């Protein structure tokens, strides 16, 4: 019975870092995400800039690591890159190639 | 198929944390800023996840007025997310619609 925390962002892998991995051996792949669209905004359209953080894990993480060139859809949810830090993240639970 | 844009979509219910003095632009356009506060449990690789989000927001015209009174209001939020300022290394989100959150 959750609280809703749903982003959908189409966008260009920009930097994907070296995979990674929890001390319990979960994979872990850092990136960042650059996108950049149109959207409606009270009645006109809107050139749209954001660059934000964003991880993936586990399967996805390693399917994913080698593709900083692509344009991806992904869902997920927002949350603050560490406790005190005052800026935003993507987690990925999902990642598609965007065909939208 | 699909004139659409690229896809920007946020769904939040979140607190009102912060609602600023209303400002116009101006045209006349009423402007709402406002902070942003959520926190929830979220699943993530079969793990319950406690998540805390801090994020600035900003309403326009006609719901930029009907909200500007309420500071200790949980609301659920429509839009999509976007840098305020050149550069700022620092999204926010642009609402679209905003109602009191029922779930």
């Not at 809703?4 to 994979?27: C, D, H, M, Q």
């Not at 996108?35 to 006109?44: A, L, T, V, Y």
Request: glycine share 8%.
């Amino acid at each position: 019975m959750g609280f809703t925390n749903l982003v959908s962002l189409a966008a260009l892998i920009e930097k994907a870092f070296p995979i990674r991995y929890t001390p319990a051996g979960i994979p872990v792949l850092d990136i960042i995400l650059k996108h950049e669209s149109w959207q409606e905004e009270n009645g006109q359209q809107c050139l749209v800039q954001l660059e934000i953080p964003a991880r993936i894990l586990g399967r996805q993480a390693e399917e994913w690591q080698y593709r900083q060139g692509d344009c991806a859809t992904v869902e997920g949810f927002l949350a603050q890159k560490s406790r005190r830090s005052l800026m935003p993240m993507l987690r990925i639970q999902n990642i598609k190639e965007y065909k939208g």
